[PDB]
Write a protein that binds this ligand. Sequence first.
Ligand SMILES: *[C@@H]1O[C@H](CO)[C@@H](O)[C@H](O)[C@H]1NC(C)=O
Ligand SMILES: *[C@@H]1O[C@H](CO)[C@@H](O)[C@H](O)[C@H]1NC(C)=O
Ligand code: NA
Ligand SMILES: [Zn+2]
Ligand SMILES: [Zn+2]
Ligand SMILES: [Zn+2]
Length: 267
Amino acid sequence: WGNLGHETVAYIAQSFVASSTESFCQNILGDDSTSYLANVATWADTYKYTDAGEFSKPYHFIDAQDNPPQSCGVDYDRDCGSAGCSISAIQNYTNILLESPNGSEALNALKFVVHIIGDIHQPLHDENLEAGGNGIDVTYDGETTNLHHIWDTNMPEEAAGGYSLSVAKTYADLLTERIKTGTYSSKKDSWTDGIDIKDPVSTSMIWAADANTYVCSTVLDDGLAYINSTDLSGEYYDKSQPVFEELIAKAGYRLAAWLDLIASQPS
Ligand SMILES: *[C@@H]1O[C@H](CO)[C@@H](O)[C@H](O)[C@H]1NC(C)=O
Ligand SMILES: *[C@@H]1O[C@H](CO)[C@@H](O)[C@H](O)[C@H]1NC(C)=O
Ligand code: NA
Ligand SMILES: [Zn+2]
Ligand SMILES: [Zn+2]
Ligand SMILES: [Zn+2]
């Protein structure tokens, strides 16, 4: 996702974490504001453009070598690659936070976890085809862009009504309501099935496989004849919106559950 998507995920997570988890995270981050997670949720996307952070570019993706829309699937050993991926990064940075939460690596580990759990939920962050749809040029509200970009940015910004941190906070409030009492309330109790702090690869792969199913059902199901030739701000956006909204919600809810496990101690 772009910045709005990441900040939205982070604000949702803030709404679900336990107080002890909040305190654990605020201490690591040096920030006890009511935007403590949201304020770091875009860091990985700036860091990757620097010489020191170049190595972390592949950590935003798992390039699933499936055959969408006919068939979708993610396989860790097949898809991660030698340079690492979102799944291997979740394992690395989660383990840093379990083993050395007071060390010098915890800060960036936590910022990575907050970001990357968001990215795992962007279906085209879990898809090899045309570099996750970057190579699929499209038209969106008259502008030339690509399919990856509209999932990261154009569509969630349109739905949220903007791109800023405050717009993200308002959007997060909306989606949080959907989880607690609204649209998602009767299904969110299954959204952490399979979660296991002792197995970050298994856990994150469940989430990645879930998001990747939407590459076939939603992202590419209209077929490339339609996608290449139709302005995607109309009916395409209409069908995409419930999907990216539920995935952003899932990302925040799952992020919060994961942070709770990271911070947890038996009293
Ligand atoms: C774990 O994270 C550290 C710090 O970013 C990095 O140096 C290291 O290569 C990572 N290890 C793996 C296996 O990804
Ligand atoms: C759509 O564009 C992609 C990317 O350039 C191409 O691989 C695909 O064949 C195109 N399909 C049609 C129908 O133009
Ligand atoms: Na521990
Ligand atoms: Zn992103
Ligand atoms: Zn992206
Ligand atoms: Zn990213």
